[model samples]
Target: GSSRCPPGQFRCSEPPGAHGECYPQDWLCDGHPDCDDGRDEWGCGTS
Candidate 1:
């Protein structure tokens, strides 16, 4: 898809279309859901 995020950033897979916001790479698996859909915390196996 057409992502508007620049370098060092990822897009939130929500808000339907291009309305999703861009989040930072460091935010991933950081024990927090930076994206609205909580996709940033996906697969973060803290076990």
Candidate 2:
């Protein structure tokens, strides 16, 4: 499917032109990695 995240949904990080996964914004930075690459927790103001 195309990489088009729905409203209130955040698309996971992926290579350019890649139709990747999408997760809820709330799920992000929740100290858990929703995406396989752990990008959901990236840049969350924590190391």
Candidate 3:
């Protein structure tokens, strides 16, 4: 029941902006690059 994200997804800053496409966070920041614009990996690797 995650409104910010699903169990196997992430956010890429696009429209609907901010909480844009709840893509696969599973592929995010794991050094494998998820979002095509690389948003999934961006603002990451620093946390």
Candidate 4:
């Protein structure tokens, strides 16, 4: 099992990191939009 970020949060693993870091509450998700708040990853529109 794994833990998930809040509605407007995300976990990102980069720079050859092992575990991903939980992004701020204003971040968006990868691929399809995940956060309804549209502030987890970035570039999410209000449409």
- TM-score top scorer: 1
RMSD of each: 8.2, 8.5, 6.6, 9.6
lDDT of 2 by residue, 1-47 (tens): 56675344335552222222443555655676767788766766287
Worst 10 residues of 2 by lDDT: 14-23
lDDT of 3: 0.48
What TM-score does prediction 4 earn? 0.21
TM-score to true structure, per model: 0.43, 0.41, 0.35, 0.21
The true-versus-predicted C-alpha distance at residue 31 of model 3, in Å, is 1.9
**Model 2 collision count:** 0
Candidate 2: deviation at residue 42, Å?
Answer: 1.6
- Candidate 1: regions farther than 4 A off: 1-7, 14-23
Name model 2 segments beyond 4 Å from true.
Answer: 1-10, 14-23, 45-47
Query: Model 4, 16-47: lDDT tens per residue?
Result: 21124443433233434444443433443433
lDDT score of model 1? 0.51
Cα error, candidate 3, residue 40 (Å): 0.2
